[PDB]
Amino acid sequence: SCATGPRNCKDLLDRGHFLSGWHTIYLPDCRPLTVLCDMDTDGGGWTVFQRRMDGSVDFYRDWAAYKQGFGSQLGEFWLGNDNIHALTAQGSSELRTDLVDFEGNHQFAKYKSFKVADEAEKYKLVLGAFVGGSAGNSLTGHNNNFFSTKDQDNDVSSSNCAEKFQGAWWYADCHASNLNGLYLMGPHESYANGINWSAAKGYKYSYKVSEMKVRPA
Ligand SMILES: CC(=O)N[C@@H]1[C@@H](O)[C@H](O)[C@@H](CO)O[C@H]1O
Ligand SMILES: [Ca+2]
């Protein structure tokens, strides 16, 4: 039941679910949602809301798609902005970003809190202090920005960043990170339109794997 069920992946870890995989949790209003738990990385108990690995899924999508979520439990997905809001509203959730390049190097970044607002406030990013990690910091520059898609420009640029740059993000003018960008497979000649984390590999290298995930702080 909702009353006795888990609220997130940390609750499931505490109950002795030790393998990563898809589990049912209960959101604050008791709506059930199936989510990917990362039980292995950095203590486990992370709820994963973004995953890229192979370029099989098109991420250049509209507001409605990002609002409801898209992709596959078997592979790449975006969990959905309504879902991410519900998951991060109550309490305080830390954020971890996990990255792998095409040369096999693992890199990460961690933030002390992470929340997205509701749709009325355009799923605005509310980001806490950078903790550290080998990937460096490419998200703080996005704090307090609305989410934007190609069809809904909420950025702080005279341009359309989502169109520029071929992704969906809390764009400013325009970005330091672009993890929902094109799956460009390592070095690319086009500027800043790949799966880029500029603090680590810059604006002209697209990562092999990207994962974004949250856990109670
Ligand atoms: C790819 C991209 O958006 N790079 C921008 C750069 O063009 C801009 O001059 C600067 C202003 O703060 O912010 C960077 O993030
Ligand atoms: Ca704009």
Which domains are assigned to the chain? 1-135+209-217 (3.90.215.10), 136-208 (4.10.530.10)
**Atom of ligand 1 at shortest distance to CA of 174?**
3
Nearest residue (by CA) to ligand 1, atom 9, is: 173
Angle ∠(193,204,126) on CA atoms, nearest 5: 55
Binning the chain into helix, strand and coil, the percentages to the nearest 5 are 15, 35, 50
Pairing of strands 93-100, 209-216: antiparallel
Nearest to 214 by CA among 17, 11, 59, 5: 11
What is the rounded CA–CA span in Å between residue 171 and residue 173? 6
Query: Which residues contribute to the annotated binding site?
Result: 153, 155, 157, 159, 173-175
Nearest residue (by CA) to ligand 1, atom 7, is: 174
> Where does 90-201 have alpha helices with state H?
161-164
What is the rounded CA–CA span in Å between residue 100 and residue 123? 27
Q: Which ligand sits closest to the CA of 148? A: 2
- Ligand 1 pocket, residue 175 CB under 6 Å: yes
161 preceded by a cis bond (ω within 30 of 0): no
- Ligand 1 pocket, residue 176 CB under 6 Å: yes
> Where does 90-186 have alpha helices with state H?
161-164
- Ligand 1 pocket, residue 139 CB under 6 Å: no
Q: Which ligand sits closest to the CA of 158? A: 2
Residues 6+ apart with CB under 8 A from 171: 142, 145, 148, 154, 155, 156, 157, 161, 162, 165
- Ligand 1 pocket, residue 127 CB under 6 Å: no
What is the rounded CA–CA span in Å between residue 2 and residue 31? 8
Amino acid at 147: F
φ/ψ of 9, rounded to 5, equals -75, -25
What is the rounded CA–CA span in Å between residue 26 and residue 86? 10
Q: How far is the CA of 154 from the centre of ligand 2 (A)?
A: 6
Half-sphere exposure of 84 (CA within 13 A, CB side): 29
- Ligand 1 pocket, residue 173 CB under 6 Å: yes
